[PDB]
Amino acid sequence: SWEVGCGAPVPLVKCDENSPYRTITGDCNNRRSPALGAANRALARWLPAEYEDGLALPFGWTQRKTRNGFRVPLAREVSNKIVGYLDEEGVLDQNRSLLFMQWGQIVDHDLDFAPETELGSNEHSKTQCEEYCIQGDNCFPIMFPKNDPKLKTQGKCMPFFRAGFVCPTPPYQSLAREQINAVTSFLDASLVYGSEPSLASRLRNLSSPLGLMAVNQEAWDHGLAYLPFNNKKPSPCEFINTTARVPCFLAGDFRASEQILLATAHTLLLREHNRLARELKKLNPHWNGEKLYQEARKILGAFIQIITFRDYLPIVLGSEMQKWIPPYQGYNNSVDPRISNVFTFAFRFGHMEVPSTVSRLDENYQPWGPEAELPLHTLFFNTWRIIKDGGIDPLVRGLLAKKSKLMNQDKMVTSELRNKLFQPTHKIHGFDLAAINLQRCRDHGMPGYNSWRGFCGLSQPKTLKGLQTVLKNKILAKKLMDLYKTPDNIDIWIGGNAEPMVERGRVGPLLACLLGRQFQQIRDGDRFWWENPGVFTEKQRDSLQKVSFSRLICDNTHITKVPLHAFQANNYPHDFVDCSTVDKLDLSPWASREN
Numbered sequence: 001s002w003e004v005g006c007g008a009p010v011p012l013v014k015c016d017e018n019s020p021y022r023t024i025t026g027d028c029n030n031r032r033s034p035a036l037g038a039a040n041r042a043l044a045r046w047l048p049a050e051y052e053d054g055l056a057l058p059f060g061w062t063q064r065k066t067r068n069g070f071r072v073p074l075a076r077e078v079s080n081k082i083v084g085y086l087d088e089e090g091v092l093d094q095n096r097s098l099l100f101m102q103w104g105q106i107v108d109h110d111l112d113f114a115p116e117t118e119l120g121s122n123e124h125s126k127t128q129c130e131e132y133c134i135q136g137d138n139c140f141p142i143m144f145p146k147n148d149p150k151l152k153t154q155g156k157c158m159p160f161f162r163a164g165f166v167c168p169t170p171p172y173q174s175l176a177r178e179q180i181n182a183v184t185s186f187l188d189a190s191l192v193y194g195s196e197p198s199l200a201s202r203l204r205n206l207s208s209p210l211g212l213m214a215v216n217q218e219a220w221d222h223g224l225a226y227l228p229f230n231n232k233k234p235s236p237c238e239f240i241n242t243t244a245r246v247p248c249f250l251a252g253d254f255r256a257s258e259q260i261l262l263a264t265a266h267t268l269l270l271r272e273h274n275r276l277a278r279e280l281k282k283l284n285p286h287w288n289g290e291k292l293y294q295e296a297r298k299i300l301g302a303f304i305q306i307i308t309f310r311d312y313l314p315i316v317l318g319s320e321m322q323k324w325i326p327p328y329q330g331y332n333n334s335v336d337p338r339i340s341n342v343f344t345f346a347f348r349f350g351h352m353e354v355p356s357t358v359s360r361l362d363e364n365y366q367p368w369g370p371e372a373e374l375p376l377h378t379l380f381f382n383t384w385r386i387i388k389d390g391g392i393d394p395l396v397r398g399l400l401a402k403k404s405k406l407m408n409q410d411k412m413v414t415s416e417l418r419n420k421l422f423q424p425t426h427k428i429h430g431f432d433l434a435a436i437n438l439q440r441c442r443d444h445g446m447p448g449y450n451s452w453r454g455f456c457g458l459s460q461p462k463t464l465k466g467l468q469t470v471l472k473n474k475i476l477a478k479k480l481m482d483l484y485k486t487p488d489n490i491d492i493w494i495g496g497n498a499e500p501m502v503e504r505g506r507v508g509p510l511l512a513c514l515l516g517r518q519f520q521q522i523r524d525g526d527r528f529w530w531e532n533p534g535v536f537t538e539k540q541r542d543s544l545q546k547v548s549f550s551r552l553i554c555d556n557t558h559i560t561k562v563p564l565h566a567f568q569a570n571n572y573p574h575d576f577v578d579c580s581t582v583d584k585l586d587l588s589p590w591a592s593r594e595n
């Protein structure tokens with residue numbers, strides 16, 4: 001809306017209705033509506049956008065204009081009064097490994113990306129946003145409230161740029177602004193391969209006819225491969241250590257080097273693809289480069305789907321799993337596969353699962369060297385600790401043997417994320433993920449907490465007493481009322497995350513509904529879902545059902561001891577078995593001749 005920094009619509013393409021392979025963009029999944037689920041379209045709207053002016057201006061843009069007769073509290077102020085805490089002791093999740101957190105980020109990145117408006121480089125805009133805190137067009141700065149310490153050290157605000165949106169089209173009549181999802185809505189390993197054909201090709205190794213992904217040629221992990229470097233300048237990964245000067249990786253997803261464990265995970269996935277391609281070349285010597293790439297790509301996709309629905313979702317959704325994701329009944333071509341705008345806020349529950357440190361463990365799962373445990377903030381956009389400080393194995397061990405943070409109404413987001421986040425475009429470890437999340441809810445025209453409760457068929461609290469009952473927490477409810485005045489005004493991100501978790505789950509009732517629904521649609525609406533008869537042969541599916549993240553690690557690292565259930569809290573050596581005892585992926589059912 002207004003067209004300043006909008007995204008150009010539908011570079012068209014004709015559909016191969018008989019191909020056994022996903023397109024890269026996600027077009028042609030749905031036959032009747034080939035664009036559903038494709039990258040670079042408007043995120044779906046489950047409820048209509050809510051803007052100050054009804055078109056594109058977010059609530060809190062204009063000081064005089066209230067929401068339902070009340071000013072919205074500052075994002076940073078909600079963060080300070082509600083989201084922060086001091087004491088890291090006792091915060092960890094005793095029945096979830098750190099791989100629980102990290103898998104969620106991986107899934108999230110497969111499904112959605114709403115990139116900030118390209119103001120351009122060379123920006124006086126960035127300057128005006130950051131230095132002068134001048135709100136206008138794409139600049140929607142996060143202003144510091146009264147007595148905020150950042151006043152004394154940072155300035156009047158943190159910069160924030162509005163999300164990219166769909167261009168208005170030749171009718172040109174007035175419509176609410178829709179933000180773009182830049183990645184394919186399908187759970188399709190797009191974070192490995194890309195959602196855009198040009199990037200997808202640049203990632204491939206087209207020098208050999210082997211259907212491999214390109215690997216780093218300047219650095220190796222004791223023989224094993226790294227992602228290639230991103231040669232785009234300037235590099236945030238160089239900026240954090242100018243001595244080291246190690247650039248970011250180049251992956252199927254732009255965000256791959258945001259933090260060291262995410263870059264680690266992207267590494268495992270790349271290695272898995274190359275492994276799969278080599279194994280398939282031995283089984284089918286006649287298969288060409290294309291066929292090899294497509295087939296391993298198709299296996300990796302199913303791997304991510306199986307881990308997510310079998311291992312991850314049950315431990316997020318708990319008792320609500322069955323209620324939103326009943327057993328599969330085949331492809332339903334009437335289901336909307338698109339990711340919804342609100343899902344991209346609901347899935348940010350992950351931010352409350354990130355602990356304040358990261359460890360490198362040695363082969364005995366003991367602290368690796370003198371600085372084994374690092375503050376998380378030092379690991380944003382950090383590639384040098386991988387390339388120059390031991391490769392990925394010591395990080396992978398930490399994933400297995402260390403724990404996720406548990407969400408806690410009094411201990412929501414670690415200060416590493418809340419005070420010291422580094423943004424790739426800027427220069428300081430000074431940003432606030434919580435305040436950004438809340439600013440972003442408004443950027444995207446999110447209906448408020450009570451609207452979503454209603455959508456989910458849940459009671460809608462009107463008074464302090466009502467809120468207390470929902471939150472089962474009198475103090476939090478009061479602090480929310482003091483800031484927001486009405487529950488109707490509470491931003492969906494803090495609203496949904498505030499609720500106590502469902503039985504055996506890690507999210508509250510509002511979020512289990514919003515997530516459950518989306519995941520159901522992600523499965524049921526996908527023509528290439530792995531369990532859709534015809535996608536894979538029955539014998540292939542029998543093989544696939546044996547995959548695990550533990551096997552993934554065994555095959556792609558020099559780690560030889562792993563737990564059988566990677567996602568629960570596991571202690572060495574009690575909970576760890578030799579790799580040789582762990583189920584393998586049998587690729588024999590992929591063997592194909594013509595005789």
Ligand code: HEM
Pocket residue numbers: 101102103104105108112113114115258259343344345347348349350351353354433436437440
């Ligand atoms: C650094 C960041 C993380 C780890 C140290 C981290 C972790 C997660 C997890 C564990 C998630 C889900 C289980 C998850 C989801 C989403 N994130 Fe978040 N995250 C880190 C940093 C960021 C930053 C920076 C953003 C952008 C914020 C903005 O609005 O500008 C961010 C976003 C998201 C997101 C929305 C993605 C989209 O559609 O654009 C998630 C679903 N995370 N993170």
Ligand SMILES: *[C@@H]1O[C@H](CO)[C@@H](O[C@@H]2O[C@H](CO)[C@@H](O)[C@H](O)[C@H]2NC(C)=O)[C@H](O)[C@H]1NC(C)=O
Pocket residue numbers: 205207208210212213214215216217
């Ligand atoms: C694309 O594939 C080729 C062939 O497999 C890769 O080549 C090999 O590179 C490794 C490491 O440099 C050597 O140890 C092998 O002996 C090489 N063999 C051949 C056949 O040349 C090549 O590096 C890949 N390209 C990229 C950019 O990843």
Ligand SMILES: *[C@@H]1O[C@H](CO)[C@@H](O)[C@H](O)[C@H]1NC(C)=O
Pocket residue numbers: 240241242243244384388
């Ligand atoms: C930067 O990297 C070097 C190795 O190149 C390391 O010894 C040094 O401590 C690093 N400095 C910072 C800023 O962390």
Ligand SMILES: *[C@@H]1O[C@H](CO)[C@@H](O)[C@H](O)[C@H]1NC(C)=O
Pocket residue numbers: 329332333334335
């Ligand atoms: C398929 O989807 C539509 C819309 O969700 C719905 O009306 C119908 O009940 C579904 N059909 C099946 C096969 O379950």
Ligand SMILES: *[C@@H]1O[C@H](CO)[C@@H](O)[C@H](O)[C@H]1NC(C)=O
Pocket residue numbers: 095315504568
């Ligand atoms: C720990 O995790 C597993 C998940 O399969 C479960 O069987 C066990 O009861 C868990 N404890 C919880 C959820 O607190």
Ligand SMILES: [Ca+2]
Pocket residue numbers: 110111183184185186187188189190191
């Ligand atoms: Ca995808």
Ligand SMILES: [Cl-]
Pocket residue numbers: 044045046047340341342343
């Ligand atoms: Cl929505």
Ligand SMILES: [Zn+2]
Pocket residue numbers: 221222558
């Ligand atoms: Zn080694």
